[PDB]
Amino acid sequence: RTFSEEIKEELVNVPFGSREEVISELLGFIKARGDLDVKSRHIVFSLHSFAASRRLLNLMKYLSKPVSEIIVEKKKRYIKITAEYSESFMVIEPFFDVALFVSFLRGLFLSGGSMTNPRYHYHLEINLFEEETLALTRKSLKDFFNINAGIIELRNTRKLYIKSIKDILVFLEAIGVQRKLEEIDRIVTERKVIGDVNRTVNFIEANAIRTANSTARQIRAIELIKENMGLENLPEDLRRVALVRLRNKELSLRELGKKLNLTKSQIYSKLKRIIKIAERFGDV
Ligand code: NA
């Protein structure tokens, strides 16, 4: 089951605050996915969500309004719900009020909205044809909940989207999601790693101390060999490595390697051999 539909399942039995909030949520369904025909007295809803379809049926039941037909129009296939038109449906001003607006948002989201699995993306969207509706919705999201949302063009439709995981949680909780807010936080909190600047400094020092102690140990090993047997009496490939280290004592192993067409690991293996040889003569 998609993460999005799991969120929508939580909303199927959210309370019906009042008749006004019920009609406001229905208007959300109507605006997003309703093909309205006042003359023939019907509304055709096209829904890709079963959670959304069940919520729509529960709203119509609350209002005591009959739904006449439920069919699948033959992934791209969708649910067609035909219901009776009532002028009361269109009388509500859904933005005027945070209670009315939250119900409108729930309707918009259930019918035409979706949300990405936050393990992969931060994305919650609402698809809508009308341009005014989307702008007004975006303004009310900001005024009421301080939620910043962008807008996207798709020719067939336009998308309102929220990319802040903070704003997404506020949005979801506002419309009545509960269980899944905990799962989202466990995912968000688990991607995080916080702080210690002193731990960072400690780590950087430790690596620098390792590198310095190694380099000193290389130099010391080369000096002992030079004193006791002569570098000229090393195997040719170790001899060049000993000289390059001794002549370039502040270079990294990578940079020492470049001077002999050797990789860092190659020059490092040779330095280890040189140190092994120098144990003969003294502490290294
Ligand atoms: Na050199």
Swiss-Prot record:
Record flagged with keyword Hydrolase: no
Family membership: Belongs to the WhiA family.
Record function comment: Involved in cell division and chromosome segregation.
Keywords: Cell cycle, Cell division, DNA-binding
Protein name listed in UniProt: Probable cell division protein WhiA
Any one Gene Ontology BP term: cell division
NCBIfam families, sorted: DNA_bind_WhiA
Species this protein is from: Thermotoga maritima (strain ATCC 43589 / DSM 3109 / JCM 10099 / NBRC 100826 / MSB8)
DNA-binding region: 252-283
InterPro entries for the chain: Homing_endonucl, Sporu_reg_WhiA_N_dom, Sporulation_regulator_WhiA, Sporulation_regulator_WhiA_C, WhiA_LAGLIDADG_dom
Bridged cysteine pairs (disulfide): none
UniProt key word ATP-binding: no
Gene3D superfamilies documented for this protein: Homing endonucleases
MF (Gene Ontology): DNA binding
Lineage: Bacteria, Thermotogati, Thermotogota, Thermotogae, Thermotogales
Domain notes: Contains a degenerated N-terminal LAGLIDADG homing endonuclease (LHE) domain, a linker region and a C-terminal helix-turn-helix (HTH) domain.
Name of the gene encoding the protein in the UniProt record: whiA
